[PDB]
Design a protein around this ligand. Structure first.
Ligand code: ATP
Ligand code: ATP
Ligand code: ATP
Ligand code: ATP
Ligand code: ADP
Ligand code: MG
Ligand code: MG
Ligand code: MG
Ligand code: MG
Ligand code: MG
Lengths: 267, 267, 267, 267, 267, 267
């Protein structure tokens, strides 16, 4: 009953895999497993006795590759990858958003095995409630619907809903609890070695000089996220273009670390 | 009229069943008194001469369990278990919800004995504040139909409205009270012994455990919810296969209780 | 007659009479003089030269048996009790609501005297703020229709639109102001004499009780509502059932009183 | 002879004349000069040089008696009085419907001089969203149809348009522009002298024995409305029955106002 | 083929070049490298093996000419230009604001290459911590929807935002980080030199000074925005009409510097 | 197809001109400099090289017929007159407030020349909050879209607008900034000589007047507006028809002044 199945991009697998992400290695493995083993290895569960987890919640500072973690799971279990955005519920008609939730779930059930990937939970959950609010009351009646098709009366299924958000601090605690969203995976800012892998992903695409030491660059870029690193390389390339080289030398990388980081914040 | 799955649906199939009556065990006895005792033995109500309780309002924090409770009971009764959901009301068009509330209830009378488990509908029922906005007032109307049909003017038959709500800090005084339920149930976080009963079921499913001490798990899991415990159990399974074991060990619980509460309990 | 208003009428032998309500007590007598006194005797209002009430408004604290009292008066008027519900009005087009208010008043003019009981005046006539727009506008659309008929321009005969509301102020000032609903009878919470009498209605239908002291019973249940007295009674009776006796005694009440009291106090 | 526009007239002179409406007293004269005088002789209005009202809107808080004043107009124009409800202008489907709006105005042109009263413009000149489809289009359409039609037959008296509205703040400017209505008569809540007069007329029909001072009661009932006074009277006679006196006296009104006033804006 | 979002596409083909605006000459070079240049020659990005910039985020005062930098670019690239005022989004009809950014984005992919200018990120950015319980959540739904399309899942599509803001400290963390706006550009009030350039352009549109010297004027105009340097020129022309010369010269220009500053700084 | 106006009311070629205006004689000439004469003479925009005026704001004491001047400028330039009322702006949300600003801008480009009358400036012209508050915020997101759009315009399609306000001293200096509103015109409360000339306009209409001395009338109406002078003349015709004479003289004028205008004195 969905022409919104085009807005769920059921076909077109992404290009981002586990090898297009990295330096968040501990995180890849739990989330990977939380839907990968249930689907390809369900006999392993039988034998030990294991309950299938019914979702994974992801949170973390912005730009750490949450989006990328989701894409990688979607790509590499190739089974029904339902991408929705929580901001996509709630319309001008009086409880259309909640109707709309019921549609995703009945659709996922039919098309099961299925993984639902929700981007942004901050536009569809609130940890407060309030009564007689214009912008914060129907969004609580499409949340309340949600709680409630994911697990509730309606089984299980084979979802496995991957939630993603930029802050869990303004999210309703019903989402926040396990039993559905059973592995609560924090994704932190990357570490010393971590910033080094992220560098090499973009650099793998690029040409470089052979006096390029990642270890030195990663020292400078301490307290920055994966998104700051992508932009550093990009911007470093722009310096390569102006000066007409088909490679990025070490000195551009240091210019870029100074440029990008400086124009974000003065720590 | 024209009923789709709406309430009409009746199902009571597993996982939640009459042998996964995890609790919170005094609380289950209270549901059995309210619903199942006049259903199975009506003559006892003729001797006292009371009106049999008309509904069980279960409330609590999330995941503590009330979906639980209500389905486990429902399989026992073998009654017409009416499943409606918490904002399937007013789909896009208006007063739609008021016609659903009536429909559900009228069919229920015909199919009485019948039980109406409505997920979160008590929480949608909220107060109005003057002047203030015209709201969001229109959904609150759909609540008023529920009061009228339950025993407001039109007899119940043998309904048995099971309420569900994540807050008692969101309700109008006119749903809260014992008058549309009567049997108002606090479902708190599971008792010391209560908590051991939840682990028992899960461990049963998870074969061999021979060094695990469930009581000790209980001291560590002080003031965790019922859905929390089930994820603890799930992650203990997971660490079991990460150590490549056919059974779940005592370390495996220690790690999962540590992981599960950390991400979800504030400092 | 279209199905609509066919089916609004007529409730044959209502449960509830004045020996199935009692305990308040003065405002009971006031309503009964207000509707039953000119219906059974038009002469007394005629001799002074006054107009009987155009309607009677019931408001205030939930649980005081407002709709219950309506079901009492219906049994002794036998003047045609039109049961419409404030939420029953309004559907998926506008003016289809209007149609229904126009139909009930035309129908009533013929049955005159007759009782139009509108469950919630506030559904179809709520305190506006502005258009937010789907059904909110329809509400003040419908309010226009109800006025209009009442004795706005069109002969009322001897109706007698009797209302009730869940909240103090949630209604347009027009309806609030008397001269349309002309007696504003606050049904308040029962008196010291009134709470004893309420327990008595229950005692009538719940067999045996003499170790109970009605006065002291009432004294404890201060600040409760008629629905709460009923709820205690149903709880008490379950208490007795647990100790297996068909007599209700005081100890059964004390346990039952506590259940309700836990909710509402500590202050 | 379409049943809908034929059914909106006539009563062959309603109940109420200017005699039976108590004092305002001076704003009665404004209405008499605004409506009645230009109807009988627009030829005299032209000869003077002035332009008669496009329409006259009655504005004031509820209960001042606005539609009460319209019944008075009705008896004394002698020109066929249209009682229509603006709630019936918007309808369930279309050009019944929209056409009904042009039909009423056509009826006026052949019945002329006449004298069309529409009655509340609450929810037929409010704001639309452009649009919410089923609600809005009806209201937006009917808004335009009203304004064009009254404009195009009044440069000068032909068909006089009268109306009234509950408030002029609950609807957006549309009918407030002096291209449309330019003469809006404040129908206040009544002067000190006005109350005394209303009290007088109501006791005029009433059988009493003289010791009443209508003036003392007026000081008391300052800050009410004419409909409350009517109520005070009906309750003052009802009191008379309860003492079993077939006469009303001062003691009874003083008491009667105390009851009514109390359920109302306060002592 | 809906005029509702198709109207936002091309602005009749701009007339504004990057030599019709200046004074922000450093900033102009930056914008061209990031946005224009990919479109100009793809192979440079291939050569260095980089992912091309997302685009530019401009911040700064008001009047600076953020619009004019998008207008310039659009003329020069020979590609789709979609100009949207970003504060126009956000409706009091809940989730219509989010719908509108969703469609503009999807349409941008249909007509790729495309540039969108989302002006003012102030009124489409909220504060997570409470300040307006209904205003923050609403704004947030619009914000996280446009972000969703921006790189939540759905590709760039060779879009190319390009988007301005008065205040950058009011933005949520989500949009603030790069990778949804790759190159954050400071665009400050005109420098010393910046005055002289802006002036010169605008006086080439007039009759031009006869007694040229923009350095004197510049000293005085320091501490104003770019619109304000223009503004003086326009004030100068009209002053010319009042004098009865209608030719602009240094005397009109200096008298204008004074006349606009009279308002501005208040000695 | 028939056209149906939006941004109501619209008068394409309004028939009120400056012949209908008297005693505001130099205020006509200033505003002819502001909009009229620029617009019909495109030579000025080449002979000076000036970039057109974008608005002129009318100020000084209210009630003077600021709407009427606006119509007279629209008449002269043969444009589409468009009315924006400020009461249809700002609620306590936003967005349809915003929408309607957009609407009249769209209509105005489409049908240039076009005169957007913008009363009233005090509900979208107000001060800034940078210490924050919530109520002020509604106004600020509305206000920026007026400010922007007017500057956004292309010189292909000239949408000149004429503002009007009661108090300029409560508004932001930002809308008193040249290149938005270039000049302001004190339309003052009428002088002695002004009042005599405004009575004469109305007298054209009125019959046999040869006893009326206009001077004694102006004296009495010290501190009277133009809307009040016009209203006095309608009322004069009412008084004349009360004394049963179609001849309007001076006695009628004197009673009309007392009745309408004289209320204000004493202080
Ligand atoms: N884990 C990482 N590995 C490699 N690249 C990364 C990593 N994190 C971020 N990036 C780069 O930064 C870009 C932009 O960040 P992205 O859009 O992926 O973030 P997100 O964490 O979902 O953000 P938000 O909190 O704003 O929703 C990526 O497309 C990638 O090029
Ligand atoms: N007491 C229990 N024993 C065993 N497992 C439980 C228990 N309570 C909850 N769970 C498990 O937790 C999961 C989700 O919780 P459930 O649906 O029962 O929550 P609820 O308290 O009704 O919440 P919400 O406020 O989100 O509607 C199910 O998998 C259920 O079996
Ligand atoms: N005076 C009374 N004596 C006995 N029982 C009473 C009395 N008044 C109320 N009750 C009981 O209280 C309950 C509520 O009655 P009712 O169904 O009339 O709702 P209400 O007070 O109109 O409610 P709402 O605010 O939910 O519309 C019933 O169970 C009724 O039997
Ligand atoms: N001046 C008056 N003289 C006599 N009776 C009055 C007076 N004013 C009001 N009433 C009484 O009030 C009623 C008529 O006015 P009513 O209260 O219906 O309101 P309205 O001002 O037309 O309201 P709305 O805006 O709700 O349509 C009658 O019952 C009448 O007896
Ligand atoms: N730097 C500048 N060079 C030339 N014109 C300018 C410059 N800055 C602003 N303007 C002009 O001033 C007017 C309004 O400024 P605009 O660019 O719309 O403002 P904002 O930065 O607030 O978006 C326009 O007519 C615009 O051309
Ligand atoms: Mg993200
Ligand atoms: Mg639940
Ligand atoms: Mg009730
Ligand atoms: Mg009325
Ligand atoms: Mg701009």
């Amino acid at each position: 009953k969905d022409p919104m199945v085009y807005g769920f991009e059921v076909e077109e697998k992404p290009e981002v895999s586990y090898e297009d992400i990295g330096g968040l290695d501990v995180q890849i493995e739990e989330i990977r497993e939380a839907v990968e083993l249930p689907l390809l290895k369900p006999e392993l569960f039988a034998e030990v006795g294991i309950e299938p987890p019914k979702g994974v919640l992801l949170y973390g500072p912005p730009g750490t590759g949450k989006t990328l973690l989701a894409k990688a799971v979607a790509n590499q279990t190739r089974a029904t990858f339902i991408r929705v955005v929580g901001s996509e519920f709630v319309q001008k008609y009086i409880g259309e958003g909640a109707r709309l939730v019921r549609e995703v779930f009945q659709l996922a059930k039919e098309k099961a095995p299925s993984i639902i990937f929700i981007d942004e939970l901050d536009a569809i959950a609130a940890r407060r409630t309030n009564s007689d609010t214009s912008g914060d009351r129907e969004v609580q009646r499409t949340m309340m619907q949600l709680l409630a098709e994911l697990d509730g009366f309606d089984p299980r299924g084979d979802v496995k809903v991957i939630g993603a958000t930029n802050r869990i601090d303004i999210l309703d605690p019903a989402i926040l609890r396990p039993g559905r969203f059973d592995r609560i995976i924090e994704v932190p800012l990357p570490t010393f070695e971590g910033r080094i892998q992220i560098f090499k992903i973009h650099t793998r695409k690029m040409k470089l000089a052979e006096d390029v030491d990642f270890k030195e660059l990663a020292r400078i870029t301490e307290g920055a996220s994966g998104a700051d690193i992508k932009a550093i390389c990009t911007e470093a390339g722009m310096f390569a273009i102006r000066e007409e080289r088909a490679k990025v030398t070490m000195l551009d990388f240091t210019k870029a670390i100074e440029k990008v980081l400086k124009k974000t914040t003065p720590i």
